[PDB]
Amino acid sequence: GRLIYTAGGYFRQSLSYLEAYNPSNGSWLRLADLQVPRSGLAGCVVGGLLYAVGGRNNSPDGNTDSSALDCYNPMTNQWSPCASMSVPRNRIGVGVIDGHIYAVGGSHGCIHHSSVERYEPERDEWHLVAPMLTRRIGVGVAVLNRLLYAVGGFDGTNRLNSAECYYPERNEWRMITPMNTIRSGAGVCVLHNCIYAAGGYDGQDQLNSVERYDVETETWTFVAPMRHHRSALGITVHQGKIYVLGGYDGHTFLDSVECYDPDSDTWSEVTRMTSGRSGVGVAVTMEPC
Ligand SMILES: COc1cc([C@@H](CC(=O)O)c2ccc(C)c(CN(C)S(=O)(=O)c3ccccc3)c2)cc2nnn(C)c12
Ligand SMILES: [Cl-]
């Protein structure tokens, strides 16, 4: 089976948890803690390693933004440090193209990054690429058809409905059609030919709305809203279904996990995380050991 891994997050302070959910049987496993607690990080998978990227350690003893890339091997249930990024990136978004990891945006203190860098596992090296046209933290990132999309976020002044696309062979960013909704800290992922943006914060409210961008039509369309309003949710795709994990609804750090069936256009509660949290990193890979 493949599992949905949730790494880090926030409740009262930044968390070190790594836990893995099995959609086939409803079970959660607690696995090895992150070496450093972090919220506002991103997860991704390349070649059966799980990567935790960026974030911030919000702790009683200080707040430290992370430039870390940490490598988890499910076969050994151990974390190893991999090469650090050029800069700390809190409230980061990540995407994988052709075995390479793109780290997009995020903050370092009051610095809101437009910069983007790319990691090569074979060399354990990061290299900067062209920066986005817009500074974005709490940025949603997805990959469709080997193109990288940066969606919404916060530019240091305004939360954003704008989005843009990176063309690797041109090393160039271009704006796409903006969303219908301003969203910072949305969950962004890809399913079929569409980029989904679920939830987020608009500077006033946490959102339950969900909309999707069809690369062929260049339009955003709303689908059914989630059962819960959520900002700083985790999101992933497992077998043609979107799963959203946790986040903040204006009142509670949610343990709710919901999944979306695109054929019925419905959201269903699927499970609860072992404890409520937001700002997690999420990805899917093989079950450990
Ligand atoms: C300033 O108020 C908020 C800003 C954000 C945005 C940033 C912005 O638009 O300014 C944002 C986006 C992405 C992440 C991962 C986070 C951090 N996370 C919530 S977190 O879970 O990592 C976290 C939790 C509490 C304290 C620190 C960390 C924030 C979302 C909010 N939703 N409600 N409000 C009241 C929000
Ligand atoms: Cl933060």
Side-chain angles (χ1 to χ4, degrees), residues 53-281:
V53 193
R56 163 183 285 233
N57 183 6
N58 293 300
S59 90
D61 273 31
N63 302 332
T64 311
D65 296 310
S66 182
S67 67
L69 177 69
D70 295 294
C71 285
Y72 177 81
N73 185 350
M75 294 233 61
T76 66
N77 186 38
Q78 286 174 12
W79 287 98
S80 320
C82 284
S84 290
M85 298 182 289
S86 75
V87 287
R89 302 185 175 275
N90 180 38
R91 304 173 287 171
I92 195 181
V94 157
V96 172
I97 302 179
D98 284 326
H100 300 127
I101 304 180
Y102 288 81
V104 176
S107 54
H108 174 206
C110 53
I111 304 304
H112 297 68
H113 294 313
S114 61
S115 65
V116 179
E117 46 195 299
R118 167 171 37 68
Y119 181 71
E120 297 178 47
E122 179 169 351
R123 295 185 62 77
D124 191 36
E125 271 171 23
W126 290 92
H127 297 281
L128 283 152
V129 297
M132 295 180 290
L133 302 173
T134 308
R135 296 169 177 172
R136 306 177 185 272
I137 76 83
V139 55
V141 174
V143 167
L144 178 51
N145 188 36
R146 286 158 80 171
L147 298 178
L148 182 76
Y149 295 79
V151 171
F154 179 70
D155 68 7
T157 309
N158 296 293
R159 285 89 185 160
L160 303 165
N161 62 352
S162 74
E164 55 193 288
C165 179
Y166 178 71
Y167 306 88
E169 56 268 49
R170 295 245 170 119
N171 187 35
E172 165 183 341
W173 289 89
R174 290 185 156 265
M175 287 289 142
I176 64 162
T177 312
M179 297 183 289
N180 294 307
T181 314
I182 292 164
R183 314 182 180 266
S184 182
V188 169
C189 68
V190 167
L191 182 60
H192 306 141
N193 211 38
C194 282
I195 304 174
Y196 287 70
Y201 178 66
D202 66 9
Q204 263 194 107
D205 295 305
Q206 300 79 25
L207 304 174
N208 71 346
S209 69
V210 180
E211 56 191 299
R212 74 181 178 201
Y213 178 79
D214 181 324
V215 292
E216 302 314 315
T217 68
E218 295 184 56
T219 76
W220 293 89
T221 302
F222 292 98
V223 299
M226 294 177 297
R227 293 203 191 274
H228 305 260
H229 295 247
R230 319 175 177 253
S231 63
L233 53 151
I235 192 163
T236 197
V237 175
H238 178 286
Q239 306 208 149
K241 286 190 68 176
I242 296 167
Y243 290 75
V244 303
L245 288 88
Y248 179 65
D249 71 352
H251 186 249
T252 301
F253 297 84
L254 299 175
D255 61 15
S256 158
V257 175
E258 291 185 66
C259 65
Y260 179 69
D261 176 2
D263 293 345
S264 53
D265 188 30
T266 66
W267 289 91
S268 304
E269 301 274 357
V270 125
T271 194
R272 288 154 65 115
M273 293 186 290
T274 61
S275 61
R277 67 194 76 152
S278 59
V280 307

